[PDB]
Design a protein around this ligand. Structure first.
Ligand SMILES: COC(=O)[C@@H](N)CSC/C=C(\C)CC/C=C(\C)CC/C=C(\C)CCC=C(C)C
Length: 148
């Protein structure tokens, strides 16, 4: 039993004012779109799914582009992602956007390098994402991946 702090309140404000507008993945060797979403995969407390083309597992590198809106100002917007296959953490990724202007829309591109078959991976891979503003944890969200 504790206070609902100033940090608890601001983390809640950032979450209620944040939306992921769209996202896509491009083959980094061709610049061509492999997968697009408009579903907000950022939303915590819902068990999200993504159905990506199995040919993605072939790519040496993919670029990921996010477009997001934030009513609240953020000093250092950043993501930590862990990739799980049946509970084993296979990858740990860090991406930094930086300062977010209040009531702004923003585009963010990152590069992911391909560090087992689609038959086995499909439905057994979870990406867990932690959304921070510096050291304030705003949300934790999870996406189960399928290769189709
Ligand atoms: C085994 O699968 C692989 O990852 C290999 N193909 C190597 S790499 C390719 C990239 C992929 C498939 C991972 C893309 C990531 C996804 C679908 C998760 C997107 C989630 C977010 C960007 C988090 C959204 C949350 C916010 C903004 C708070």
């Amino acid at each position: 039993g504790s206070e609902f702090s100033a940090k608890d309140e601001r983390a809640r404000e950032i979450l209620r004012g944040f939306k992921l507008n769209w996202m896509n993945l491009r083959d980094a060797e061709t610049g061509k779109i492999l997968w697009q979403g408009t579903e907000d995969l950022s939303v915590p407390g819902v068990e999200h799914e993504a159905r990506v083309p199995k040919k993605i597992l072939k790519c040496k590198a993919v670029s990921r582009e996010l477009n997001f809106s934030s009513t609240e100002q953020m000093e250092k917007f950043r993501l930590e992602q862990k990739v799980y296959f049946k509970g084993q953490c296979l990858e740990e990724w860090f991406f930094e956007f930086g300062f977010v202007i209040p009531n702004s829309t923003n585009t963010w591109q990152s590069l992911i390098e391909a560090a087992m078959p689609a038959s086995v991976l499909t439905g057994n891979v979870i990406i867990e994402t932690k959304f921070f503003d510096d050291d304030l944890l705003v949300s934790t969200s999870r996406v189960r991946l399928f290769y189709v």
